PDB file of C-alpha atoms and ligand atoms in Angstrom:
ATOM      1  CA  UNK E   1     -87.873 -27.110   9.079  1.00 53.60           C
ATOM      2  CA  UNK E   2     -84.374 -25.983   9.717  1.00 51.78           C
ATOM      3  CA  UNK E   3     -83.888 -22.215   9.213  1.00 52.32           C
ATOM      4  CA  UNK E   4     -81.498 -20.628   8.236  1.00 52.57           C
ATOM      5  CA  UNK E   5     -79.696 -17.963  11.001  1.00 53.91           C
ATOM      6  CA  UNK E   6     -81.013 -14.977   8.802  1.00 53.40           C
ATOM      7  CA  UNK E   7     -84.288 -16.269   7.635  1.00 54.85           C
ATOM      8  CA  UNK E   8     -84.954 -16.720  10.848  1.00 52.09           C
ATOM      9  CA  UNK E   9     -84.159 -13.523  12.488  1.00 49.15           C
ATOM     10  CA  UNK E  10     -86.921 -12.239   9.409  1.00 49.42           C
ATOM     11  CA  UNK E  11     -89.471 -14.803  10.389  1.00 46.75           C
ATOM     12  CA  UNK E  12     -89.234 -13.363  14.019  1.00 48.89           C
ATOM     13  CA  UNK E  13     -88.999  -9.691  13.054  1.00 48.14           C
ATOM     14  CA  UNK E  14     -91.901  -9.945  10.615  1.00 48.56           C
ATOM     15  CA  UNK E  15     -93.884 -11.809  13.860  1.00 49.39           C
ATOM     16  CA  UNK E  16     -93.098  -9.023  16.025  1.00 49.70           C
ATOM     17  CA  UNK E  17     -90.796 -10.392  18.413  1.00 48.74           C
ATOM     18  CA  UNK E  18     -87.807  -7.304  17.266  1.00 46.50           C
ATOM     19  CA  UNK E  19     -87.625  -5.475  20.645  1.00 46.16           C
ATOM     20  CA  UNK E  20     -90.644  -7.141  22.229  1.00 52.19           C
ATOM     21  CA  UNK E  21     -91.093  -6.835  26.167  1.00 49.46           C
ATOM     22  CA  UNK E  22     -87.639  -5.052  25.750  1.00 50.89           C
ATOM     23  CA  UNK E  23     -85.678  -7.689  23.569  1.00 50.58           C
ATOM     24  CA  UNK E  24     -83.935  -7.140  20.659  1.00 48.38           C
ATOM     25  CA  UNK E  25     -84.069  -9.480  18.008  1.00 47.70           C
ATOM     26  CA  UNK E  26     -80.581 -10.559  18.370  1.00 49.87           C
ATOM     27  CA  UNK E  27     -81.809 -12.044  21.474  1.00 49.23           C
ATOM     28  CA  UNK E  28     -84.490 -14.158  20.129  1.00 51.14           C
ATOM     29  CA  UNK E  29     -82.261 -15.598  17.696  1.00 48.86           C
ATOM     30  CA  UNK E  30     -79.677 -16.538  20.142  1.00 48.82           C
ATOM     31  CA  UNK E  31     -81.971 -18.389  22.021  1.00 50.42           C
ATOM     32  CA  UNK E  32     -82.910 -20.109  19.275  1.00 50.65           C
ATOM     33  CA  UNK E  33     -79.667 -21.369  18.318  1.00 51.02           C
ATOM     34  CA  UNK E  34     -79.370 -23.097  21.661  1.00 46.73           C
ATOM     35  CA  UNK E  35     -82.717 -24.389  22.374  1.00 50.43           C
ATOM     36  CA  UNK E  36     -83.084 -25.961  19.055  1.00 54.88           C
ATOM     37  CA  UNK E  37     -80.061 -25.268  16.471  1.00 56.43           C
ATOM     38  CA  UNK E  38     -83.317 -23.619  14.674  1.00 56.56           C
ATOM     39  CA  UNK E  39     -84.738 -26.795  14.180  1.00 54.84           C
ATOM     40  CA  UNK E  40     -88.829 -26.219  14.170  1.00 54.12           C
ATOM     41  CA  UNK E  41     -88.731 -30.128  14.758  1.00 57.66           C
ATOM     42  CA  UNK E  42     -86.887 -30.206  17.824  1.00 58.14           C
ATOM     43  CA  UNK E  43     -88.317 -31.975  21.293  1.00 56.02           C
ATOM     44  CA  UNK E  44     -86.520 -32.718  24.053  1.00 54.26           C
ATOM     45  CA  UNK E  45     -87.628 -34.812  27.361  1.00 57.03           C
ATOM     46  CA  UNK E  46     -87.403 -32.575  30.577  1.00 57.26           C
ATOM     47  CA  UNK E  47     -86.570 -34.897  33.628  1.00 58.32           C
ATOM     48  CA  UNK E  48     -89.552 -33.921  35.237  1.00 58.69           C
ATOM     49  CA  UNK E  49     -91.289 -36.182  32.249  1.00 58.12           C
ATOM     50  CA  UNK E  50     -93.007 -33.183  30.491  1.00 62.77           C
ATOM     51  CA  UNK E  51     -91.202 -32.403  27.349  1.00 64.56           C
ATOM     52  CA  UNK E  52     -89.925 -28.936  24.796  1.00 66.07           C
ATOM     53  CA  UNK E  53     -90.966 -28.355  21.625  1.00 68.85           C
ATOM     54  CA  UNK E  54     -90.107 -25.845  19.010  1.00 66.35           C
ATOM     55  CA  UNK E  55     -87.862 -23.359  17.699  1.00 64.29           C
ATOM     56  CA  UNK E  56     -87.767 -22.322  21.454  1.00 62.73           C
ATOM     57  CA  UNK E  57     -88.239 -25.258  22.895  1.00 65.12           C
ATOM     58  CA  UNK E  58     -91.608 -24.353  24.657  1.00 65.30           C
ATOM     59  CA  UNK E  59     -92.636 -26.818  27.487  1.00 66.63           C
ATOM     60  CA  UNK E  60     -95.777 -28.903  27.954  1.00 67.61           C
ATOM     61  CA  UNK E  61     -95.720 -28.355  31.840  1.00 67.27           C
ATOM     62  CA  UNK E  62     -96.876 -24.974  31.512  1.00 68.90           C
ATOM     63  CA  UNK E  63     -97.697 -24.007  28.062  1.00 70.21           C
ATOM     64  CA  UNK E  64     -99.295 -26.590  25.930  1.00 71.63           C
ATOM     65  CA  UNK E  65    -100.793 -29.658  25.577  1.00 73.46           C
ATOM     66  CA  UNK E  66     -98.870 -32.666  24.508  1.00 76.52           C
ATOM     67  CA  UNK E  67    -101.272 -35.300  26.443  1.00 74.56           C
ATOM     68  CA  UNK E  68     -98.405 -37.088  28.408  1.00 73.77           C
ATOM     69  CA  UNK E  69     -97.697 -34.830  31.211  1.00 78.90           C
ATOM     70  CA  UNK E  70     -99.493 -35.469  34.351  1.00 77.92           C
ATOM     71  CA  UNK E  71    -100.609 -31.617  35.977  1.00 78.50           C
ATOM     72  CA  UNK E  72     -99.510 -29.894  33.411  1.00 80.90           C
ATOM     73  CA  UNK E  73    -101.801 -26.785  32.363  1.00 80.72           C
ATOM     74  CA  UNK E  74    -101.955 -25.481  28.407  1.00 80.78           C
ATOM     75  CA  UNK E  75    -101.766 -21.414  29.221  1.00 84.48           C
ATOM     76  CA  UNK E  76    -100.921 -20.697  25.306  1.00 82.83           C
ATOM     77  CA  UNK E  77    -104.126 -23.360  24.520  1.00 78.16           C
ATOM     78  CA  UNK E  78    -102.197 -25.350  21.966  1.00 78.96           C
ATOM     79  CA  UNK E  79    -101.165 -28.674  21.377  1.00 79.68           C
ATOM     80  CA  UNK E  80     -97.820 -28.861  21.271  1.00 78.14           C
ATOM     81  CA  UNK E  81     -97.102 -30.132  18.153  1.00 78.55           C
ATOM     82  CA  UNK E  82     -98.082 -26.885  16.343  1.00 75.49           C
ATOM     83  CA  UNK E  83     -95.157 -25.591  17.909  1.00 76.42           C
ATOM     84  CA  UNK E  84     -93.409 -27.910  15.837  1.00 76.23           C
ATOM     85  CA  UNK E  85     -94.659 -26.735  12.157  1.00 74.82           C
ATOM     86  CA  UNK E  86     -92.040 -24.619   9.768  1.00 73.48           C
ATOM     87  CA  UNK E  87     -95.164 -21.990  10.170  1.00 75.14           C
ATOM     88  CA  UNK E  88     -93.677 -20.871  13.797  1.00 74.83           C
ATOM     89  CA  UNK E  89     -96.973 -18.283  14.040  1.00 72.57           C
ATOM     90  CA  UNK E  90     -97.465 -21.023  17.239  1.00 71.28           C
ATOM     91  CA  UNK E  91     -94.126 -20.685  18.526  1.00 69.84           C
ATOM     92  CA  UNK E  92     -93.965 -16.779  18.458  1.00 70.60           C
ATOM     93  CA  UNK E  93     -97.360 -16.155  20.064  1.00 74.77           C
ATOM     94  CA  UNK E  94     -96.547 -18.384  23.166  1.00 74.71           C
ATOM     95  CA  UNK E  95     -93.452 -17.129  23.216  1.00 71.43           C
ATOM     96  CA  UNK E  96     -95.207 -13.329  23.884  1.00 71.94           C
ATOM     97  CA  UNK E  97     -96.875 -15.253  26.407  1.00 72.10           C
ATOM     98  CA  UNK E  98     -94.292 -16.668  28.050  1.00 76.69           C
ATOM     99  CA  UNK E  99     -91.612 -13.610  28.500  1.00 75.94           C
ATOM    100  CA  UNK E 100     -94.469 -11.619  29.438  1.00 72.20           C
ATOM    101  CA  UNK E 101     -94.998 -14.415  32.248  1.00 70.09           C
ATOM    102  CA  UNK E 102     -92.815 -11.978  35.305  1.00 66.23           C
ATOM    103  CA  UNK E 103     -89.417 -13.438  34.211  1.00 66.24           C
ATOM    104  CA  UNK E 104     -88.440 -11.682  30.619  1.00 69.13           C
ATOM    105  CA  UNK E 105     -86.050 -14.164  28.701  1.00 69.14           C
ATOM    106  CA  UNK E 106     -84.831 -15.638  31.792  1.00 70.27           C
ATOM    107  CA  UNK E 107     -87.727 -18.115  31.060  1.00 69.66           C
ATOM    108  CA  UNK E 108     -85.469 -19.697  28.629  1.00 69.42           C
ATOM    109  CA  UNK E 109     -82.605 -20.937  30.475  1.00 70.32           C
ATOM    110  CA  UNK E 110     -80.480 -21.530  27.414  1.00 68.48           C
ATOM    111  CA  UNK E 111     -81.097 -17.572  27.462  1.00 71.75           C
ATOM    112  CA  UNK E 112     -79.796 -16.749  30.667  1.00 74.51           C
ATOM    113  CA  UNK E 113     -76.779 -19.078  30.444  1.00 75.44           C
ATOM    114  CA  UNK E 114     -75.537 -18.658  26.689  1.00 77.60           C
ATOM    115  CA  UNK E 115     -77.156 -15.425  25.292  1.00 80.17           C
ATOM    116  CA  UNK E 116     -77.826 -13.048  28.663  1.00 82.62           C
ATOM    117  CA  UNK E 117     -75.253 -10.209  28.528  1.00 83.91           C
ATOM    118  CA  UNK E 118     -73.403 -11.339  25.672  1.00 79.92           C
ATOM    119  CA  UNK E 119     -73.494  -9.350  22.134  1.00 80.34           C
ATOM    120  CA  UNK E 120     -76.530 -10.856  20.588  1.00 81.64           C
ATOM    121  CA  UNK E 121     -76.636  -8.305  18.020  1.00 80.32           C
ATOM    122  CA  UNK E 122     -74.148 -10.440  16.541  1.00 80.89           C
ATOM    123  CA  UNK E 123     -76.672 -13.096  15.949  1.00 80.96           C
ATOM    124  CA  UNK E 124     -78.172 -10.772  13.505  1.00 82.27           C
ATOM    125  CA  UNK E 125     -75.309  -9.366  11.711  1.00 81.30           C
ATOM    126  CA  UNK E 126     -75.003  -9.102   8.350  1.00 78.14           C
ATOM    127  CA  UNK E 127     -78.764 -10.211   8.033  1.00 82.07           C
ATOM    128  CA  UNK E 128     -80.941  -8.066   5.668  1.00 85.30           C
ATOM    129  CA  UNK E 129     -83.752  -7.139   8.130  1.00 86.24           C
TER     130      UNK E 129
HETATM  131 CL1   CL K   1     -75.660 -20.288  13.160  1.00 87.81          CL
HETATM  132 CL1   CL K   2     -79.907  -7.522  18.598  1.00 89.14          CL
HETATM  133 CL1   CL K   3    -101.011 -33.655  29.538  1.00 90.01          CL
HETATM  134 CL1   CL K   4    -104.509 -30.295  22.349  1.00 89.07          CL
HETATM  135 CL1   CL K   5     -92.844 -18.751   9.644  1.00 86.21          CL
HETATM  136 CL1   CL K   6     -77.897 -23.809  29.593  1.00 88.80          CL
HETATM  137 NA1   NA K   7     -99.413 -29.441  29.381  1.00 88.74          NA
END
């Protein structure tokens, strides 16, 4: 499922990620953009051979199982094509996990290097929230 920039900031405010661990929604939806142009559908091969999945592009090294990568752990105990569905329930709760991990958004490096600092509030504008 593609979503649209506003229906998505709802899905994500209605799944409690508005302000969580500190991070405005604005934030969340930024990230999105980049990681996956909010494209539920979206995977992308990491050179280290594990792979991202998802709205936010969630990584089967760490967080869930996809059955291809070698050493990998599954901390959100998913496969990783749940975090693939237009239902991104999946997505949202690893994503708690994950910028609760010690990090924040800095996790996402898409984050750090296109959304950190800038004025993500505009990513929300105009949306009825
Ligand atoms: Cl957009
Ligand atoms: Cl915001
Ligand atoms: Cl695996
Ligand atoms: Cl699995
Ligand atoms: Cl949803
Ligand atoms: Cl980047
Ligand atoms: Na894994």
């Amino acid at each position: 499922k593609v979503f649209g920039r506003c229906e998505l900031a709802a899905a994500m405010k209605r799944h409690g990620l508005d302000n969580y661990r500190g991070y405005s929604l604005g934030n969340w939806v930024c990230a999105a953009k980049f990681e996956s142009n909010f494209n539920t559908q979206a995977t992308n091969r990491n050179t280290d051979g594990s792979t991202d999945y998802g709205i936010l592009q969630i990584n089967s090294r760490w967080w869930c199982n996809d059955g291809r990568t070698p050493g990998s752990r599954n901390l959100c105990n998913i496969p990783c094509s749940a975090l693939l569905s237009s239902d991104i329930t999946a997505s949202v709760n690893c994503a708690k996990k994950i910028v609760s991990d010690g990090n924040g958004m800095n996790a996402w490096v898409a984050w750090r290097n296109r959304c950190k600092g800038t004025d993500v509030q505009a990513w929300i504008r105009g949306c009825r929230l």
